[PDB]
Design a protein around this nucleic acid. Structure first.
Lengths: 345, 217, 251, 121, 216, 107, 121
RNA sequence: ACGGAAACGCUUUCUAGCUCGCUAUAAUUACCCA
């Protein structure tokens, strides 16, 4: 048969956070111990409204009282002595090191972004996330797919053409569609005991410091092998999937000589397999054709938080060190570093 | 003579599917690409057209020698099962598919399911200026199963052509375990498992004791 | 098998034969030309036309001139030959009578085994509707497909119908379905159907094989030219020309 | 205001009054407005007009309320559809519906707009 | 003596039914295959002629001897039941298929039914160039029940072929429960089922009570 | 007042051969559902008429019992029928003969 | 309150009533409220609008009951969101949700607010 | 002593056949404000 299957096994060096759109707020979790409890807040409200206490809950939510210890809905339940914790939702244990602040102030996390999930209650990694990470490798390592794929100044000129890849029905022409012929399937959904909720940590050049950010996305625990399939249907696509194991290294070599250099070696990790940069935290130089988006990306940021010159910030996190998967102290990962190996089946 | 038999397969979903439908009054910030669902039960259907016209292309790249370029050009190993409409003697079907209604609307509520579809958020990262373009495509969830009935006709025009055709029905029903079953496809959305391929006659008298062995192979 | 299995009946008639015999010649001059010799000569000329020479005009055709002469002609026959025979009879009676003495046919299309009294009366009603259309008309097939002989023969039967045959018998994509939808849009006809046809022809223009597209482009610009001409005289010609074409290509 | 003699002519000389693309001399004198940003507005009124025959008007007056939501929202996203509803006066054809035959008249107005948009490139 | 045997039944749908009406030019975005509709209430309608034609060609696959060349070339068991245009004794014979008129027009409305005909969007993928031609084709609701009745009239000419014909009619209803009854039936439309079969004499006198046992 | 556009519908229909499986379409114009029609039926009473009128009315009303079971119209074996009768009153005009025993045989 | 034939207009002149920057003449009449917080308001109600299409009111009224507290909390974060829920009567309209056919109407009111925000600046 | 009397424009006929709602698409980007 023409359908030459594959088997991708992926590995988490740095934590990976993927989409889900929604996020909890400062008053949507419980923190009784090393577990953060994330309940179904509709059912929390439905149990708590029985005491006629919800009007008190109307006062607590707009209450910008200081000393964040008493702002995070644990003090609401430690105050009005609601003592069940029998609500729905999921409850994940702590990263243990994303609370740079003083002990017992700790637990004052603010805005947590959910991981993508299917409806049974487990998480997974979508096939479309891996497929969009694969497409950047295949677009930045094929040297015919970097030069003319730009704006040509049609509108205000920021936009790409998006036609330089075989795309579409295209009247009269035989059906080409290279990326129809690369069919990445979804991952086998794992369990919530590999999620740690890292905090974002920005490590800039020209002010050599690691100022953290108040954005605490959920993520994947490091050293987790994840199953995937790439079942092609054209031998032209079979060439690209066979050369993934070399094009990933070539992409990383044209990356590390370009952006990871001018940032010190201790913040960088090793590879141990072939390298890939999965979504949400890797920055806009793994989501882009970066060798042509150096002068077009920085035009968009004419706002209060412009990029510092070009190639402005490197994104790190804080996870438990599991190995040693680092090469430095204080556990600064890369937030999106992952490593895969491929094989025909 | 005239008989008619029936395949009671069960499409189990594996990383479930999204058969699209178009709605002009959807929302602003909600579903803009919904699964096609039944109007009165609001369960997602796998309609029979997306099964039939998927098996048609699967077996049309396989059971053809001349490159087809159209239906009404298949090599009559297909067109006596799926029907042409330009050949004279093969206008009618001989295969009657069905819509695949969702069986386990209660073995899904046994698990922690609060809606029989799941809405996936799916941005489009512009490779220059890094900007997104979100969407919300709806899809039916993983552990669904769908009662898939398929009906095969038998007249006195099948001199020796009955048991040949189950090398076409089993070929389609384990090439759909290779293909995606309509959907985004190259982003997941397809893989399925036709459990319990259990043929039985429903009109006429026919021996299917010889038939149930080339289905469990 | 290129025909519908019908048979047509034409009852022709000279318009104003009585006005051609009472006054007749006194229009030219001061009442000095309506005399006895010219009257007898004109009478022998018209009987010589309508009784002898109809056999020459209907020599090869597959019809049967039941009754003919004076003014009135009643001819059954196969339908292509009936229509061509009326065309030849008018195109020889204006050559005979110099463009004076307009005649008025009315043709009716009938299935087989219908009686030839239910046939003759419906054709007579068609014919008097043609005479009441104007002084000269041919009423093809129905009480709304009324034309002029000056316009049915040139525009409908030889200009438009040969253009539709020249277009359609060159290609192998558009079949009977496109012609049927074209007649449906020509028959329903509000103003909104001009926009629906502008969408339909432009949609089908780029649906073709892209090599021979300008065949369809010079057809569709021409069809939209005689849909939206806004004279009411170039639209019914297109409807009847497509009726005659679908009749000609019916299996 | 649009009535039964003019709502196709209004659509014709409202598509013609629209402005053309300056650059892109491959297929030049073409429109800014892509076909999708207009088919995804006729998609609403076509499924209205197929429902206006079945249903009474006073059970179909939430969908017509959503019409003025969606036309305003598609206008505020790109300047092309904003120019469309300012040229072909679609908002001032949406305050004035109030009964069934006018709703079908507005649906046929939208259809005439799409038809003459497909006709002129 | 002379009698009429009305067959009240309900046609409960499954995989909702499309029976085409006009082939007229669909509006520019509108429904391309409109279903047939009662012009007063605009509800769906199964006509009696779909119910006659499909049942006719289903019993003809069973009750012939040779393959017929036309509906007049049938057997003696089907020409007396349906009608032979050629014979001198089988014109207008033994069955009036009345229409079917959406019995539960409000039990659907007690559930969450917007309108009584859904619009299934659909397309076709070309083999060479893989384009797509969509279609918005219309079909009735999945759980409608239509009102089926057949005035099987006895003629005082058979008098022992009465029960002989109901082994044919219940067979035709079983075949309609297996075949599709109108529309794109090899794409899973149609699929009728027959709730509450009941034969009842409306004129004359016959023993229909010894005859509902086969209907059951 | 029930809300309708034109008084006759056009039922589209077809014919399918059992050899070619080829369609052959028809259009049947049809008077639409739940129309009423002013039906009336003079029955004249005369001298020879007398003493049998009791079996002219268990037949007339046995005849109107039949038209609600047979079709009354062309192509009635494919629908196209089901005529019902209502307001079936038997008045009297130009005569001296009561009808108010007949009027409960019907209604 | 809001019925089917007013909620767009009620949502129209609300955005005409919203405050703007009195200072800062850079795209003047720029609001104090931005598109992101209004979308973060609408994202509370979108899932409810879908579950009012699929499910019933009875398995849903607890989600509606929490949605009021969601709007309460989003009011207490920013002064412009504290005012938008007062110009457009949102908390006045959340008290009156008695049906599927009122919840869908409230979600169309939220979408009308977002549409008329996007149309204006 | 009604150019009248008697007389169903009626029987037979599936809107039917064929056709994937499909093609591309990482819920992500920027770095801070009081």
């Amino acid at each position: 048969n023409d359908y030459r299957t594959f088997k991708l096994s992926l590995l988490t060096l740095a934590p990976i956070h993927i989409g889900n759109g929604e996020k909890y707020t400062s008053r949507e979790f419980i923190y009784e111990n090393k577990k953060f409890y994330f309940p179904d807040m509709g059912k929390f409200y439905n149990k708590m409204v029985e005491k006629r206490l919800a009007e008190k809950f109307e006062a607590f939510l707009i209450q910008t009282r200081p000393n964040a210890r008493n702002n995070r809905l644990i003090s609401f339940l430690n105050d009005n002595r609601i003592a069940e914790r029998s609500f729905g939702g999921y409850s994940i244990s702590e990263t243990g090191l994303e609370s740079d602040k003083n002990p017992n102030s700790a637990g004052a996390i603010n805005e947590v972004n959910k991981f993508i999930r299917d409806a049974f209650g487990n998480p997974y990694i979508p096939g479309s996330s891996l497929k969009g990470a694969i497409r950047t490798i295949l677009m930045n390592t094929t040297p015919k797919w970097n030069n003319e794929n730009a704006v040509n100044d049609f509108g205000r000129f920021p936009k790409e053409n998006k036609n330089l890849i075989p795309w579409g029905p295209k009247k009269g022409k035989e059906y080409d569609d290279l990326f129809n012929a690369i069919r990445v399937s979804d991952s086998k959904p794992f369990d919530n005991k590999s999620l740690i909720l890292v905090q974002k940590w920005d490590y800039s050049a020209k002010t050599n410091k690691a100022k953290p950010l108040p954005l605490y996305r959920e993520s994947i625990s490091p050293l987790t092998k994840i199953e995937f399939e790439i079942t092609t249907t054209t031998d032209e696509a079979g060439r690209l999937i066979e050369e993934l194991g070399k094009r990933a290294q070539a992409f990383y070599k044209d990356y590390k000589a370009f952006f990871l250099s001018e940032f010190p070696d201790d913040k960088i990790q090793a590879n141990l397999q072939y390298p890939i940069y999965l979504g949400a935290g890797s920055g806009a130089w793994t989501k882009t054709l970066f060798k042509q988006a150096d002068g077009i990306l920085q035009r968009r940021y004419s706002r209060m938080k412009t990029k510092m010159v070009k190639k402005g910030v490197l994104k790190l996190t804080k996870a438990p060190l599991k190995t040693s998967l680092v090469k430095n102290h204080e556990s600064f990962y890369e937030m999106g570093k992952a490593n895969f190996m491929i094989k025909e089946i | 003579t005239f008989a008619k038999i029936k395949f009671s397969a069960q499409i189990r979903l594996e990383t479930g599917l999204h058969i699209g439908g178009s709605d002009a009054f959807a929302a602003i910030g909600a579903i803009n690409s919904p699964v096609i669902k039944d109007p009165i039960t609001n369960l997602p259907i796998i309609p029979g057209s997306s099964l039939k016209g998927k098996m048609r292309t699967l077996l049309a790249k396989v059971y053809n020698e001349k490159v087809a370029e159209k239906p009404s050009d298949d090599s009559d190993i297909l067109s006596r099962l799926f029907g042409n409409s330009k050949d004279k003697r093969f206008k009618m079907g001989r295969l009657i598919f069905r819509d695949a209604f969702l069986s386990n609307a209660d073995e899904l509520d046994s698990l922690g399911v609060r809606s029989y579809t799941e809405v996936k958020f799916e941005n489009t990262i512009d490779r220059i200026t890094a900007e997104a373009n979100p969407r919300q495509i709806e899809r039916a969830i993983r552990n669904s199963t769908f009662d898939f009935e398929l009906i095969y006709e038998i007249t006195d025009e099948n001199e020796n052509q009955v048991e040949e055709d189950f090398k076409v029905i089993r070929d389609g029903l384990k090439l759909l375990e290779l293909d995606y079953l309509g959907g985004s496809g190259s982003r997941g959305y397809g893989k399925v498992a036709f459990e319990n391929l259990k043929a039985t006659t429903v009109f006429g008298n026919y021996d299917v004791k010889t038939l149930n062995e080339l289905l469990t192979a | 098998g290129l025909g519908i299995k019908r048979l047509a009946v034409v009852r022709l008639d000279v318009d104003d034969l009585g006005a051609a015999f009472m006054a007749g010649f006194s229009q030219q001059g001061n009442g000095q030309y309506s005399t006895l010799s010219r009257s007898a000569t004109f009478s022998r000329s018209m009987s010589l036309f309508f009784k002898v020479y109809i056999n020459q005009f209907a020599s090869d055709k597959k019809l049967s001139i039941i009754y003919a002469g004076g003014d009135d002609v009643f001819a059954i026959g196969s339908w292509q030959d009936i229509i061509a025979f009326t065309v030849e009879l008018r195109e020889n009676f204006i050559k005979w009578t110099n463009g004076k003495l307009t005649l008025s046919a009315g043709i009716g299309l009938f299935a087989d085994k219908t009686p030839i009294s239910l046939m003759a009366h419906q054709t007579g009603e068609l014919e008097e509707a043609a005479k009441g259309n104007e002084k000269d008309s041919i009423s093809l097939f129905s009480s709304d497909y009324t034309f002029k002989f000056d316009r049915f023969i040139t525009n409908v039967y030889d200009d438009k119908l040969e253009q539709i045959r020249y277009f359609f018998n060159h290609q192998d994509e558009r079949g009977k379905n496109f012609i049927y939808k074209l007649i449906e849009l020509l028959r329903n006809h509000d103003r909104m159907n001009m926009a629906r046809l502008a969408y339909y022809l432009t949609r089908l223009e780029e649906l073709t094989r892209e090599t021979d597209r300008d065949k369809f482009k010079t057809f569709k610009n021409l069809f939209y030219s005689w849909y939206t001409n806004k004279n009411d005289k170039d639209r019914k010609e297109a409807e009847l020309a497509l009726l005659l074409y679908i009749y000609e290509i019916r299996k | 205001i649009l009535t039964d003699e003019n709502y196709v002519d209004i659509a014709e000389k409202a598509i013609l009054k629209l402005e053309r693309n300056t650059r892109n001399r491959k297929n030049p004198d073409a429109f800014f407005l892509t076909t999708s940003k207009l088919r995804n507005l006729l998609s609403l009124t076509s499924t209205l007009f197929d429902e206006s025959k079945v249903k009474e008007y006073d059970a179909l007056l939430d969908r017509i309320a959503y019409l003025r939501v969606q036309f305003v929202y598609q206008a505020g996203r790109e300047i092309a559809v904003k120019d469309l509803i300012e040229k072909a006066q679609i908002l001032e054809a949406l305050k004035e519906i109030k009964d069934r035959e006018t709703l079908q008249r507005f649906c046929r107005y939208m259809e005439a707009l799409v038809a003459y948009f497909k006709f002129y490139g």
